[model samples]
Target: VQDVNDSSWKEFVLESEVPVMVDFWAPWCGPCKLIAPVIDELAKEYSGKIAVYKLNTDEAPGIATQYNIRSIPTVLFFKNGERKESIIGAVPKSTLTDSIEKYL
Candidate 1:
């Protein structure tokens, strides 16, 4: 699938009913690679109710730099266009699910 590019991100996710979970990462990061599948699973499991997207740090320097992302696998949760929480690290799917539930 094509990535949810920066131009359409705010409109696509902020206006939605379900919470949006964003994975801030880079393709070459080991920690990001480990958490990639977990994010994918979470996206599938929460498929109709919640939104998930992966934003590459290398590709989206503006957003990443804005967020001051200093690590791989930085997860950001937003509800009603407002940020609810943020976490960093390569955690498990269950851990991520619990994290995503705050805005759900």
Candidate 2:
């Protein structure tokens, strides 16, 4: 899996053409691991419609602080460079899709 670096964070997520879905996660969290595959699959599914990526909370604390991520696997949705929605903890993909659709 690709680890998102600080320098590339804004360009990938905030400056994206389409909506962005950032999965804020860590490897050690069981719930984070469980939802990881789902987000990846959704990334492939919505390939051109949106930009999906992961930011490691343990490594990228600066970005986490900016987003105020207080939990593992915090899903953030951005549209036109602004935060449109956010969800914390592991959840079904349907719930995630619903939230992102508002931005989509």
Candidate 3:
């Protein structure tokens, strides 16, 4: 998955024609680490159809705060620049796909 920060989020996620999935995570979070691989796999599986990105809460606290991200492993789903739904914590791959399928 690609990395997104304050400067690029608007263009990468908000302005994309496809649906965007931004996973908010931190280096020290165990659940975030667990879900990292799953997120990457989804990125590949949905390539050219969905936009998958990651934002490090430790590195981009400003962006995290803007989204009211109080926990790690927060998956924010965006469609047409609006937040459609969110999933928190390390969930099954099926859960991720189900959410993506909704927007797709």
Candidate 4:
């Protein structure tokens, strides 16, 4: 997955033509580390169908705050520039896939 920061937020997430999935996390968070691989796998699995990106709260706290992400490992889904769904914590891959299926 690609990294999306303050500078690229508008073009990458808000203006994306495909569905967007942003993983809101920080490096120090244990749960975030646990789910990092899963997020990457999803990025590959859904490659063309969705635009997957990661946003480190440590670097881009403003985006996290804007999305009201209070927890680590928060996965937010966006479709057509609007927030669609959110999954929190280090959940199973199936759970993540189910969420993706909803938007796709």
What lDDT does model 4 reach?
0.78
Give the per-residue lDDT digits (tens) of candidate 3, residues 3-95: 678877888889888888888878887546446666778789888777878886777768888878876777788877888777776367788
Q: Could you report the Cα RMSD, in angstroms, for every candidate shown?
A: 2.9, 2.6, 2.7, 2.6
Q: Show where candidate 4 strays beyond 4 Å.
A: 30-35
- Candidate with more favorable, higher lDDT: 1 or 3: 3
Model 4, 1-104: lDDT tens digits are: 45677877888988888888888778777546446666778888898888878887888868988878887778887887888788876367788888778978
Query: Model 3: how far is 18 from its true place, Å?
Result: 1.1
C-alpha lDDT values of all predictions: 0.70, 0.75, 0.77, 0.78
Best by TM-score: 4
Global lDDT of model 3: 0.77
Worst 10 residues of 2 by lDDT: 30-39
Worst 10 residues of 3 by lDDT: 30-39
Candidate No. with top lDDT: 4
Q: Candidate 1, 14: how far from true, in Å?
A: 2.4
TM-score for all models, in order of appearance:
0.76, 0.81, 0.79, 0.82
Off by over 4 Å in 2: 30-35
lDDT, candidate 2, 1-104, per-residue tens? 26665766877777877787888878677546446765777787777877877887777869988878887777888876788888876367787878767757
